[PDB]
Structure formats: structure tokens, C-alpha cells
Amino acid sequence: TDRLKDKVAIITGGVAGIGLGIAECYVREGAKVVVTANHNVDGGRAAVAKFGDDVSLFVQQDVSKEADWQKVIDATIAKFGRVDILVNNAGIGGVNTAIEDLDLADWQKVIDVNLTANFLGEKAAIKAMKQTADAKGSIINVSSVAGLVGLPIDPAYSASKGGSRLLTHATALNLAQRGIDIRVNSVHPGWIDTSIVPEDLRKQIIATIPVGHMGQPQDIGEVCVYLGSDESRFANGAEFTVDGGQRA
Amino acid sequence: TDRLKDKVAIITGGVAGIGLGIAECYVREGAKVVVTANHNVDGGRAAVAKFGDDVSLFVQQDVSKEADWQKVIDATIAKFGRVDILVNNAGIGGVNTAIEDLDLADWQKVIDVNLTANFLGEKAAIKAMKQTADAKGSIINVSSVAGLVGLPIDPAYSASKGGSRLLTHATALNLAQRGIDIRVNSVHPGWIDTSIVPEDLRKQIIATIPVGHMGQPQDIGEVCVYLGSDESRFANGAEFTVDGGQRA
Amino acid sequence: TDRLKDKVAIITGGVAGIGLGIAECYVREGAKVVVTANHNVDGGRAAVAKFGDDVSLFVQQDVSKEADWQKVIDATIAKFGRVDILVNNAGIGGVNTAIEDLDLADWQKVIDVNLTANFLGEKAAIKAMKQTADAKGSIINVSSVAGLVGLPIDPAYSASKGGSRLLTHATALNLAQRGIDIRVNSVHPGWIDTSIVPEDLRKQIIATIPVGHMGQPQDIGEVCVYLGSDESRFANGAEFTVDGGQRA
Amino acid sequence: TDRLKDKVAIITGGVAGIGLGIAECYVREGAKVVVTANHNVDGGRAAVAKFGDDVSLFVQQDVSKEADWQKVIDATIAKFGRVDILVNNAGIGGVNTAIEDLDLADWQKVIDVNLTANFLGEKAAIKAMKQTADAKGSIINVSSVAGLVGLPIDPAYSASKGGSRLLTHATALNLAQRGIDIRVNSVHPGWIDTSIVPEDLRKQIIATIPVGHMGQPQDIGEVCVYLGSDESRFANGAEFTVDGGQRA
Numbered sequence: 006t007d008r009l010k011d012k013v014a015i016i017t018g019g020v021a022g023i024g025l026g027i028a029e030c031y032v033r034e035g036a037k038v039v040v041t042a043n044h045n046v047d048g049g050r051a052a053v054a055k056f057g058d059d060v061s062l063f064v065q066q067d068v069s070k071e072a073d074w075q076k077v078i079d080a081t082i083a084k085f086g087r088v089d090i091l092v093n094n095a096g097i098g099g100v101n102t103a104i105e106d107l108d109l110a111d112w113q114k115v116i117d118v119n120l121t122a123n124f125l126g127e128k129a130a131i132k133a134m135k136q137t138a139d140a141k142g143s144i145i146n147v148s149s150v151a152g153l154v155g156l157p158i159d160p161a162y163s164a165s166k167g168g169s170r171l172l173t174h175a176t177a178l179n180l181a182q183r184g185i186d187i188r189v190n191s192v193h194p195g196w197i198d199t200s201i202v203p204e205d206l207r208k209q210i211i212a213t214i215p216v217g218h219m220g221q222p223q224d225i226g227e228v229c230v231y232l233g234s235d236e237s238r239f240a241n242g243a244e245f246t247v248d249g250g251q252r253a
Numbered sequence: 254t255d256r257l258k259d260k261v262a263i264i265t266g267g268v269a270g271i272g273l274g275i276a277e278c279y280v281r282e283g284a285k286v287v288v289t290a291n292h293n294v295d296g297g298r299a300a301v302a303k304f305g306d307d308v309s310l311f312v313q314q315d316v317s318k319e320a321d322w323q324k325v326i327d328a329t330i331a332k333f334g335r336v337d338i339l340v341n342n343a344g345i346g347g348v349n350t351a352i353e354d355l356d357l358a359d360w361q362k363v364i365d366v367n368l369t370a371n372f373l374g375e376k377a378a379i380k381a382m383k384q385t386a387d388a389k390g391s392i393i394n395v396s397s398v399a400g401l402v403g404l405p406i407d408p409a410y411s412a413s414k415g416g417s418r419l420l421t422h423a424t425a426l427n428l429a430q431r432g433i434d435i436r437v438n439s440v441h442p443g444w445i446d447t448s449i450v451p452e453d454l455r456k457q458i459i460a461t462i463p464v465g466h467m468g469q470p471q472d473i474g475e476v477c478v479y480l481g482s483d484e485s486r487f488a489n490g491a492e493f494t495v496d497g498g499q500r501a
Numbered sequence: 502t503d504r505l506k507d508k509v510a511i512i513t514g515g516v517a518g519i520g521l522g523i524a525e526c527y528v529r530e531g532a533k534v535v536v537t538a539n540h541n542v543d544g545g546r547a548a549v550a551k552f553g554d555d556v557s558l559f560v561q562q563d564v565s566k567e568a569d570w571q572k573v574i575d576a577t578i579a580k581f582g583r584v585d586i587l588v589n590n591a592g593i594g595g596v597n598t599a600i601e602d603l604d605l606a607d608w609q610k611v612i613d614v615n616l617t618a619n620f621l622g623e624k625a626a627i628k629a630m631k632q633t634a635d636a637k638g639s640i641i642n643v644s645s646v647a648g649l650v651g652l653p654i655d656p657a658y659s660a661s662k663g664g665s666r667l668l669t670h671a672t673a674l675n676l677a678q679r680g681i682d683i684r685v686n687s688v689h690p691g692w693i694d695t696s697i698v699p700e701d702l703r704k705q706i707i708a709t710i711p712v713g714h715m716g717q718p719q720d721i722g723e724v725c726v727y728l729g730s731d732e733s734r735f736a737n738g739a740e741f742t743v744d745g746g747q748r749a
Numbered sequence: 750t751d752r753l754k755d756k757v758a759i760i761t762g763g764v765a766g767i768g769l770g771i772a773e774c775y776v777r778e779g780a781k782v783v784v785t786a787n788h789n790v791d792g793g794r795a796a797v798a799k800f801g802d803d804v805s806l807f808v809q810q811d812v813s814k815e816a817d818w819q820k821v822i823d824a825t826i827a828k829f830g831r832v833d834i835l836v837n838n839a840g841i842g843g844v845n846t847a848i849e850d851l852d853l854a855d856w857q858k859v860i861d862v863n864l865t866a867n868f869l870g871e872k873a874a875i876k877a878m879k880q881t882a883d884a885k886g887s888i889i890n891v892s893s894v895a896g897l898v899g900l901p902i903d904p905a906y907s908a909s910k911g912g913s914r915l916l917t918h919a920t921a922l923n924l925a926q927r928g929i930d931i932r933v934n935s936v937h938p939g940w941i942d943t944s945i946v947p948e949d950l951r952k953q954i955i956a957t958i959p960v961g962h963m964g965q966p967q968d969i970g971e972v973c974v975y976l977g978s979d980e981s982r983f984a985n986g987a988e989f990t991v992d993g994g995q996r997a
Binding site: 502670673674677678680682691711712713716717720723724727732733734735736737738739740741742743744745746749 | 750918921922925926928930939959960961964965968971972975980981982983984985986987988989990991992993994997
């Protein structure tokens with residue numbers, strides 16, 4: 006009955022909030038998980054303690070670093086022998102500062118983590134899937150509907166989001182044309198309740214949500230199980246939004 | 254399992270092809286189904302036979318007719334006592350004809366069946382869910398990515414599809430704003446291998462499919478299980494495409 | 502030199518607000534105009550007085566009526582000898598009532614006026630262009646970004662808008678595939694300051710506009726001059742939004 | 750005529766092909782142009798020779814380099830005293846190679862030139878417009894509908910394209926929110942017949958174009974004249990596609 010039986014998944018930013026929600030759903034459905042985080046060893050160790058070290062592994066990872074991708078792939082294969090699913094969930098939020106005041110370094114850091122990182126991950130995953138999973142698998146690029154509560158005014162955040170969306174389409178088709186059965190899809194969470202916020206802000210947030218409340222981390226986990234499993238074999242290069250109607 | 258335990262679903266055009274695949278998945282997951290068809294009595298009887306009459310019911314229905322909607326609602330409540338899910342799947346395909354040669358009656362028939370029918374269905378389903386299911390439910394509007402092999406040149410078919418897409422958004426928001434927990438989403442199948450695919454066009458159809466092959470009815474059934482179940486409680490007014498990369 | 506020199510245009514809903522501003526720009530650029538309205542003879546006469554009866558003509562027209570389209574075509578050809586441009590601008594607004602409370606007759610009226618009317622006009626213009634303009638011309642379907650101030654919750658209004666958008670694509674492609682050089686594009690005004698904007702809502706409306714103010718009828722006129730003229734010969738099946746950032 | 754009377758415009762990649770087409774239309778409408786190019790001194794000198802030293806200037810520019818932007822702004826201000834319009838037209842095309850074979854350096858090259866360059870341009874333009882044009886101006890981001898003949902399989906090309914589109918929206922809104930009258934819009938050319946179009950590839954290319962022929966450089970120029978001028982004062986954060994129906 007386990008919908009992800011025998012699957013091995015890598016989930017970046019997988020030790021807290023949304024990513025932890027995905028990992029929880031994956032473990033529930035019988036998947037072995039490798040959860041990564043750049044600077045959250047405590048969260049990492051706690052997740053493995055929660056899941057059990059027989060079905061989970063924590064690896065420190067900066068997703069913008071090509072070398073950390075090879076590190077994570079190697080650790081996943083040593084521990085679990087294969088790679089079936091990659092969830093690119095790690096990311097940086099938006100800021101409300103003026104575009105003409107944006108330092109190139111701050112633009113570049115966002116592109117590095119929210120866009121280029123997704124490419125680096127897809128490429129690493131694809132190679133590992135050809136090597137260990139008979140050239141089959143599933144890749145999921147997660148990017149929120151909004152990074153800011155107001156108008157989407159953050160140039161770097163928005164650019165990285167639009168970039169990742171089209172990256173998803175192009176990657177799927179690039180593989181598809183060559184008969185490689187590795188699917189690439191994107192998932193777009195609305196506002197998910199992962200921490201406390203000042204009540205003025207929270208009201209603003211919930212005001213942007215037609216159903217009048219935030220979602221939960223496992224709401225994202227559920228659509229990720231669908232996309233990770235063989236149930237969605239014909240879903241490819243597509244976008245899956247779970248946002249309480251936020252962009253309806 | 255039983256991801257749809259005790260749910261009662263109405264599936265239009267549910268006795269052949271995509272609709273039947275949806276029905277199969279729903280029954281697999283514990284749903285009670287009412288499958289309908291305009292001109293397929295034998296198919297309806299045969300589907301009930303394989304599902305069993307304790308968990309399925311066949312009702313003859315022309316989805317373009319308001320009176321037939323009340324007929325199905327009435328029969329559904331008589332048999333199963335409630336309505337939890339409506340899958341608007343029934344509809345007609347596109348044609349090659351010149352725009353300026355199109356008769357109003359022929360335009361109108363397509364609008365009636367492929368667009369107006371979905372409004373009538375949503376309205377009938379909402380009333381039934383308010384009356385019998387504590388004003389909670391899930392409505393799924395199914396609309397193919399493509400109605401024709403080549404360029405989407407059919408004005409009535411395209412209009413109806415674009416129409417149904419925005420209907421889904423507006424209906425979900427209309428309900429959400431009044432705090433009614435009835436979610437409305439759309440599903441968009443690519444080319445699915447069924448008897449209604451024109452034989453002479455099969456090889457040409459496949460050449461438009463990036464993954465190089467048609468999908469199966471149960472591929473659409475799986476995403477419909479997700480959207481019918483409470484697993485998708487935060488998915489609303491959104492579009493779920495299962496198409497082998499066709500519109501990627 | 503006049504950018505619409507020798508061109509003959511029909512503009513529906515052309516004697517008030519947006520339609521009148523389109524007419525004003527067209528006349529300024531040397532076009533001859535046939536402006537129509539369903540119930541506004543005084544406005545029609547006043548527009549002709551302003552423009553001059555040598556370059557303009559008023560015809561009463563209900564755009565939802567097939568017979569009225571033939572009437573307008575006949576009168577245009579009788580007065581000006583040809584038809585080069587059709588601007589489908591006439592239409593009705595949205596309401597904020599519950600989807601499940603909507604009468605079919607009320608749904609149907611909006612689809613008749615805001616969707617089917619556009620098909621009728623396209624068909625009438627195409628035959629006229631083939632007959633009198635060497636099978637060349639430009640058709641413009643105008644549908645605003647928003648019909649209501651708040652969330653787009655009107656199902657009939659939204660469906661007709663989504664419907665008219667894809668109608669534009671399909672018609673453009675239907676013609677192009679047969680080598681017919683009649684272009685079909687859509688124009689999408691944001692909030693324009695005219696007498697038909699509800700007084701009570703003017704302040705709430707302006708809040709939804711990123712640039713902080715409404716536009717002017719001639720703002721829509723300018724983009725329509727571009728689309729009606731030979732300047733946009735390669736612009737086809739496309740969407741031109743002039744909305745002060747409304748849907749950005 | 751002079752629809753761009755007294756306006757000063759910077760056009761990157763403006764000495765051949767599409768860029769040159771924009772430059773020609775701009776000069777026709779009374780604009781003064783600064784055309785740039787990374788490695789085409791000949792093309793640059795030919796353009797200035799054609800236009801005349803009094804209304805045109807050529808400056809060498811690598812759009813990926815922050816320092817070259819400061820150089821081009823300084824040169825424009827020394828020559829013409831102000832900056833009114835920026836057309837980000839410079840760009841790299843796509844390749845048909847496999848995503849998992851793509852080197853980070855080659856990915857990064859495309860992001861640098863086709864995405865980050867647009868940001869650097871916007872930023873420099875905005876500063877110059879606040880400084881010299883009373884905080885009013887128009888910025889146009891140009892990106893082709895397709896880089897490749899076949900499926901859009903280039904991950905870097907597509908990502909930068911999707912990124913540039915969203916950058917346009919966010920940048921427009923970032924400015925608009927602060928009451929800054931600098932509009933940002935994008936333009937999307939289909940296949941345009943320029944010197945870099947080789948044989949028989951022509952057949953495949955034209956086969957993707959519903960109107961059955963490539964467009965001309967001035968087709969892109971004409972819509973850019975609309976966006977650069979005061980005729981489009983309410984067009985903001987929007988996408989203007991001129992592609993003969995290619996993505997319809």
C-alpha cells in the first residue's frame with residue numbers, strides 16, 4: 006500500500022517547514038529520504054532521529070555549490086544505493102527594497118540559490134538516475150506563489166521564480182525528446198503556516214488567501230507524493246499549484 | 254488505502270475512455286460512483302456490473318440539459334444519500350472547418366455541451382453538497398489540452414475550453430469568498446489512448462507528444478483521486494495538467 | 502501622414518467611453534468609422550457630429566444578434582464601400598452574486614453578449630473583408646482585465662472572458678492555416694475612467710492599480726491604432742494588455 | 750510625424766538584425782539613438798554613417814558587464830544629455846545539446862547575458878532617468894518566442910527567457926508602487942528574417958509559423974515605437990508578442 010515503496014528521495018531544505026512536511030509524507034509512504042540543509046545541523050539531526058536512521062540520512066548542503074551536489078549524491082548512493090526522486094525545495098525569500106538600489110551581489114546570490122541551484126540539482130539527479138535507477142525518476146522544482154506579502158516587486162526573487170518555471174519545462178522536454186523517462190515538474194505552495202509572525206502581517210497574509218487561512222507543510226507533501234510516485238508517469242513539464250486560490 | 258472512503262462521486266461521461274479510468278480509480282479507493290453517459294446504455298450497465306451495484310449506479314444524462322442535472326442529483330441522493338465529488342468529464346471534440354463557414358447552431362451546440370454544461374453541473378453539485386454534505390466538496394472540470402491533432406484552429410472548441418478554464422477559477426473564488434469549503438479545480442489530459450481517438454490520426458498525434466506515446470485513462474484517474482480526496486484540501490482554483498509534456 | 506489612411510473600421514460600443522476613445526484615435530489617423538451602440542442614438546448622433554458625416558456613420562446594433570451583424574456590414578459597405586477593421590468592443594459587466602444562485606437565463610445572456618457576439622462579428626467581418634478588402638484585414642477583440650473590483654468571482658463574466666481570449670487565438674490560426682491574411686488579436690484594458698465606472702467603488706478600484714490611477718479611453722485607442730494598421734502585419738493571435746500594471 | 754520627438758534611446762545589440770530594425774524606426778520617429786554591440790565595430794560605424802553623427806552614437810558594450818553599463822550611460826549623457834528609453838535587445842541564442850551534459854560555465858554565460866544583463870540595464874537606465882528625465886521613462890526587454898527550431902529544450906535559454914519575463918513584471922511594479930513613472934514592458938519577436946538565417950533551416954523555421962513566413966526587423970521596431978512613446982503611458986509590466994501566431 007506504500008505509495009513510494011523502495012523509492013529513494015533527496016529533499017533539499019528538507020529539515021524544516023515545507024521541506025520537512027514533504028519528508029514526513031515521503032517516509033509515511035515508504036520512501037527512504039536524504040534531507041539536506043545549508044546551516045541547520047540541529048534540524049537535520051532531529052529529523053533523522055524522528056524518521057530513524059534506517060530510512061533517513063542528513064547531509065549538510067549549500068545548493069548553490071556544484072561540489073555539494075556531488076557530495077550529496079555520493080552520500081545518498083553510499084547509504085541507500087540509488088536515487089529515484091529529487092525535490093529541489095531549498096530557497097531564499099524576497100525583500101521589498103527598490104530595484105535600482107539592489108547590489109549585484111545580492112541579485113546574484115538569489116539567482117545562485119533559487120535558479121542556478123535547481124539546474125545543478127537536475128543535472129546531478131539525472132546523472133545519478135541513469136547510473137542507479139535504469140534512467141528513470143522524478144524531479145520536482147518547488148517555488149512559492151509569492152515571496153512577499155504585497156505586490157510581487159522583488160526583481161531577483163521573481164526572476165528566479167520565472168526562470169525556474171521555464172527551466173522545468175525545458176528540462177522535461179530536453180529529456181523527453183531523447184526517450185529518457187525522467188520527469189520534471191514544478192510545485193507552487195501558497196502561504197504555509199511554518200512560523201509565528203506579527204499579527205498585522207499575518208492579517209495581511211491571510212487577506213491575500215481566498216480560503217481565508219494558511220496551508221500546512223503536509224499539503225505540499227501530498228502533491229509531492231503524487232509527483233514522486235509512478236501514479237504520475239504521464240505528468241511532465243507541468244506546474245502544480247497548492248495555494249488556497251491565491252493566484253486564481 | 255481507501256483514499257476516498259465513503260465519498261460519493263458523480264462522473265459524467267464515465268462509462269468509456271478517460272471517464273471510466275477515473276471511475277476505476279475512484280472505486281479502487283473506496284468511493285461510491287454514479288457514472289453517466291448520453292448515448293451509452295450498454296457501457297453504463299457493463300460498468301455497474303464490474304464495479305458492483307452496491308458501490309456504483311448508472312444514470313443516462315445529456316450534460317447540456319438542465320433537467321438532466323436534477324435527474325442525476327435526484328438519483329444520486331436516492332441511491333447513496335449524498336454528493337461529495339463531481340467530475341465534469343463529458344464533452345465533445347473539435348473540428349477542422351473554416352471559422353467563417355461555421356453555422357451559429359453548430360457554434361452554439363459546442364458552447365452548450367463544453368462550457369454551459371459545466372456551469373449547470375457546478376451549480377447542481379454545489380446545491381447538493383450544501384444540502385447533504387455539510388457544504389463541503391470537490392468539483393473537477395476536465396478539459397483536454399488539445400481537441401485536434403495540429404494547430405488549435407476550432408473557434409468553438411477553443412472558446413469553450415478557455416471558458417471552462419476561467420469558470421473554474423471564478424467558481425472556486427465565488428465559493429471561497431463566502432467561506433464555503435467546496436473546492437473547484439481543472440484537470441487537463443493530453444492524448445489518452447482510447448477508442449475515440451481517430452485511427453487515421455494516431456501516428457500523427459503521437460508526433461506531437463514529447464514523451465513519444467499516449468497516456469492511459471487511469472493516468473487521469475490518479476490525479477482525480479488526489480483532487481477528490483482531502484489530501485488536496487488547499488488545492489483550489491488551480492489547473493492540473495497530465496499530458497506527457499504536450500503543452501510544456 | 503495618417504497611420505490608418507484609407508482604412509474603414511467598424512467599432513461596436515463606439516459612442517461612449519473606451520469605444521469612443523478608440524473611434525477618436527481612428528478618425529485622427531485618417532480612418533473612416535462606423536460606430537455602433539445598442540441603445541444610444543443620442544450618443545451616436547453626437548459622435549458623428551464631432552467627426553463629420555463624411556468620415557463617420559452611426560448604426561444601431563445589438564451585437565448578440567446575427568441579423569444586426571448583417572445590417573451593420575451592409576450599411577458600412579453602402580457608406581464606405583469596404584471593411585478593413587473590426588473592433589469588438591461592446592459588452593456587459595460582471596455581478597457579485599452566488600454561482601449556485603445564478604439563473605441559466607442570466608448565465609446565457611452574458612455568454613450571448615460577451616462571447617458568442619464576438620464569434621458572430623468575426624464571421625461577419627471576415628466575409629466582408631474577403632468580399633471588399635482582398636481578403637485582408639484586422640479584427641480586435643476587447644475584453645477588460647477585470648469586470649469587478651474584488652476577486653474575479655463572476656463565473657459567466659469570467660467564462661466569457663476566458664472564452665473570448667482563446668477564440669482570438671483559434672480564429673487567428675484558423676485563418677492563417679488557409680493563407681488568409683486577416684489578423685485577429687485581443688486588447689485588454691485595465692480600469693479606464695469613464696461614466697460607466699460605479700461612483701461608489703472608484704476609490705477601492707484605484708487601490709488595485711499599481712500605477713495609482715485609472716487610464717483614459719484614448720490609451721486603448723492608441724494600441725488599437727497599432728493593431729488596425731499595417732504596422733502590426735506580423736502581430737497575430739496575440740494579447741495586448743494596457744492596464745497600468747493591473748495583472749502584472 | 751515624430752512620435753519619439755526629442756527622446757533619447759539606448760538600444761543594445763542595435764547595429765544588426767532586429768536591434769537595427771528598432772534603431773531605424775526610432776530614428777524615423779525623431780529619436781536620438783545610442784546603439785551598442787559587443788563585437789561589431791563595422792556594424793556600429795555603418796549605422797552611425799547611415800543615421801548621421803547628429804542623431805546617433807555607437808558605443809562598444811558587453812551587456813553582461815556592470816562597468817560597461819556605466820560607460821554607455823556616461824557616453825549617452827555626454828552626447829545627448831539625457832536618457833529616455835532603454836531597449837534591452839542584446840542576447841545569446843539557444844543550443845540543442847543535452848541538459849545533463851551542460852557545463853556550469855556555459856549555463857552561467859547564458860544567465861549572465863540573457864538575464865542578469867537585463868537587470869543591470871534596467872538599474873542603470875532607472876538611475877539615468879531619475880537623474881536626467883525627471884524620473885520618467887520606458888524600458889523594453891526583448892526576448893524571442895523561440896531560440897531553437899524544434900521543442901524549446903534549452904534549459905539555460907528558456908530559464909533566462911522566463912526569468913526576463915518575470916523580471917519585467919516585478920521591476921514595473923517595484924517602480925509603480927513608489928509612484929515612479931518609469932514603465933517596463935517586454936517584447937517577444939517570432940522568427941525574423943535577418944542575415945543570420947541559413948538555408949533549408951528556413952523550411953523548418955517557416956513550418957513553425959502559422960502565417961507561413963518570417964517577419965521583418967521593422968516589425969519589431971514598430972511595436973517598440975509604441976512602447977517607447979507617450980502613446981503607451983498606461984501599458985506597464987505587460988508582454989507584447991509579434992510572432993505571426995507562433996505561440997498562439
